[PDB]
Symmetry: C3
Subunit: 289 residues, 3 copies
């Protein structure tokens, strides 16, 4: 059957999503995960929760062992990963309190281990060139959107709905993220350049987590929590740590509701062909073979 | 009391701007700084000078230990840092021989240690998320512009003056820089792309120096020397002009130190320190 | 005094361009190269070939030791380097099966050793700031283009010819590449941003290879093989890539012959003089 890993960002250190069955420590060919993993059940759906930044939020986005976290969830038999990401908005219609079910990204990270395969010692032998045109699992994306509908959260889809139909607080049914390396926030100059490229939000944690998930043969979807307008607007709306966590409290209640419904909706369907296609995509991407 | 640190770039490998009182061979948690630090006074204002690339200019931009350079100045009690940066112009009105008091940047560096904090080698415990919307100390920026005026150098502010005020050589009162990693210069393709993004100049050394200065609680301002047009558009004349630009910048730096020491900075220093404290993600 | 090195990418992990005269297992001051280097002759012209990814194609683009590859070729006496690079098209008129003799690039790589000089122990002493406005050797570019003409391969020059004179498959007489770090391909978002910038193709291996070749005082030119459209827009592509490899081999063999047919004394002089004039450490400025 299925088993859903949850990767919690800011505000989701120990989200108490179910009734904790146990705590498990996993070892990985790529090092230790950010923390031990909490195993349990949402309904009768197996679920495991892993905080991205560890215990007391001591691991910055740039130094998170994304390889170990994803592989640990794969090792425990996860078929899916749902992840949360706090983010700043680059557009007027994405406002604090909204959420975004991302479908695209632009990568500006560096110095992070972004692949399981290579020639280095602590890498799997081989060369893996994975396609990433649409880098998320689309079925799992639509689960997150449907979970929002089931919880009476407004859903805004810019592909068919105009900006006059956008009703806050809402889940944006698509969106593109630029992932910066951190730990600093962007300059106004960088923020305007990203905006001019058409990007919707900026975060620090999406990449390479999303890429490694696909490399691992797992279905991955992310829901971003809009906490601020980055720094392209007026000075009082400029992002800081205080502003990011201030918006978060009312949002985490709704995000947790979305995540819990999504896990149940995943367990209500058959994923046999999707899981097989995920694994076959990894094999067809090996260019050493 | 104020104490002004100066980080000298290309053309300032061993400036000797004042009668030196002493020299400090220091070390920091993040390693050795680029060279010995030279101590003296401009009037009654204490001043410390270090060459970004070392006395021999043997250290390329991506291998400069920016963390050690900023922290060594912090350890000596510096309240300000003034820095020079040689650059290429991406825009028609910024010509070789001009200067730019930068107020913005777009970062394309990689592989450099750009934060004092983390879970990394030598890094301090914690997670620091500094706001960087306007990344310089604005008071110190205006002191640089004011020093240029008192040195009879034309000041051009495109936001507030007409085109006819752009008389060369001039100090541009604002501007944005793309910081590339080096050591190679840009291709024509890259230069065209950076120009289309609206950037004013290209350089190799501003980042992470400016970021670490804010992390250290110090007021930072940069004055860039336009040394040529980047390749979106004879070397004996360019070299002679750069020598004149170095003379102009030495005089701006010396005047700037005196202007800084004429004002009180208690509030700004405390505000710099408080911004660091409120940026600790692990503590909130 | 002329000797042509060849760096083969995808489709050239086991090149077999000429009869192997000698097989060199070399080391460099910057590590070992991707594989043994094979020496031989194309006609009377000495030649050296090296698979960028190794025979097993086990080395991904970001882990290739570009320093060692370029330096090993130079240590063996090479004056030129011809390189192949598989790529995706970002433009309508560059169709799979076409080739591109590149003249420009935009670099989005990171974490790769991109210079021979510096202050670390595994680098040469000094600070080298190389100009790169037109980063390839123009004479060698034109030899690749002329080689395509001599082998009856269409050449499309957008500066000279009409857009309807673009007959496929063809060698494009110019073009710009974005080099991404890999190993993953681009997202649709990134592909559209790159296309919006005006870039022609996307690849993973051009940089820092082209930059190190100029640092080494060598004439470098690249021929890119369009294998697909990038995602702005399995067997039929494999058969199309098989045909592309055959015609790229023909271009490479002909280009070596054309290089050996001319005098390069002044060009080589200028290559070496550019390295020396680009030193900015003060005791060797
Ligand atoms: N403005 C911002 N930039 C990057 N990451 C963020 N996380 C929350 N707000 C952010
Ligand atoms: N064109 C240029 N690009 C980058 N750094 C420079 N320093 C001086 N000129 C430069
Ligand atoms: N689309 C693509 N992107 C990067 N490298 C490639 N090599 C072949 N096709 C490619």
């Amino acid at each position: 059957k299925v088993k859903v890993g949850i990767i919690g960002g800011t505000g989701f250190d120990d989200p108490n999503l179910f009734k904790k069955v146990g705590v498990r420590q996993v070892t990985t060919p790529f090092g230790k995960p950010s923390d031990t993993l909490v195993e349990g059940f949402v309904g009768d759906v197996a679920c495991v929760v892993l905080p991205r930044h560890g215990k007391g939020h001591l691991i910055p986005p740039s130094e998170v062992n994304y390889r170990a976290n994803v592989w640990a969830l794969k090792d425990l038999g996860c078929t899916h990963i749902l992840a949360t990401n706090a983010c700043g908005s680059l557009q007027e219609d994405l406002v604090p309190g909204d959420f975004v079910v991302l479908n695209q990204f632009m990568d500006k990270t560096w110095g992070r281990e972004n692949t399981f395969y290579g020639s280095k010692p602590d890498s799997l032998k081989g060369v893996l060139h994975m396609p990433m045109a649409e880098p998320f699992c689309e079925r799992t994306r639509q689960i997150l959107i449907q979970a929002a509908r089931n919880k009476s959260i407004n859903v805004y889809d810019k592909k068919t709905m105009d900006k006059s139909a956008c009703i806050h607080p809402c889940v944006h049914a698509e969106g593109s993220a630029v992932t910066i390396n951190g730990p600093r926030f962007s300059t106004r100059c960088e923020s305007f350049i990203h905006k001019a490229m058409g990007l919707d939000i900026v975060n620090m944690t999406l990449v390479p987590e999303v890429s490694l998930a696909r490399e691992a043969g797992l279905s991955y979807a992310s829901i971003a929590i809009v906490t601020d307008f980055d720094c392209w607007k007026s000075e009082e709306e400029h992002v800081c740590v205080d502003m990011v966590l201030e918006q978060f409290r009312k949002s985490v209640v709704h995000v947790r509701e979305i995540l819990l419904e999504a896990v149940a909706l995943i367990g209500a369907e058959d994923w046999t062909k999707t899981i097989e296609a995920n694994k076959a995509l990894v094999m067809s991407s090996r260019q050493d073979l």
